Amino acid sequence: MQIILLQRIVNLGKLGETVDVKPGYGRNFLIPLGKALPATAANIEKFEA
RNA sequence: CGAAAUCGCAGUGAAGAUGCUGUGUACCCGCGGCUAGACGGAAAGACCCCGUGAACCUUUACUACAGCUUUACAUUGAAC
């Protein structure tokens, strides 16, 4: 899963950087608890703006 | 229950004859009894054998399946 970081978290990357995570990690923790967003054009534009 | 003008004996005969041979006996027809025979009636023998027949049962017969169980992947992630 390609995902944009919404905050610093260890061993993955910086704020706003796009990482690849395991689908379970991305789907069950980060996105539901508001630490990242799915990697789409409409979300990268939202974050950059 | 094929139809009968439906006797005994010794033989003969698909090998135990009311029906064939020889012979003996016997006038025609009932009624009351009897069950020696009509291999009597009844049930396409269940005993036995056969059929590349059936069924159900058993098992360390064959081949399978349910169920149980093992591991690989997915649901399934993070850190040391």
Q: Which nucleotides in chain B have some atom under 7 angstroms from a protein Cβ?
A: 75-80
B75 C1' to A4 CA distance, Å: 25
Nearest nucleotide over every DNA/RNA strand to the A12 CA, judged by C1': B78
Experiment used for this model: cryo-EM
Burial of A32 (0-12, 13-18, 19+ CB in 10 A): exposed
Task: Return all residues near A35 (Cβ < 8 A) that are at least 6 apart.
Answer: A5, A6, A7, A9, A29
Cβ atoms within 10 Å, residue A1: 16
Footprint of strand B on the protein (CB under 7 A): A 10-11, 21-25, 27-29
Which two structure tokens, joined as six digits, stand for A22?
């395991």
A27 CB-near residues (< 8 Å, 6+ apart): A1
For every residue of A10-40, DSSP letters joined together read: TTTB-TT-EEE--HHHIIIIITTTTSEEE--
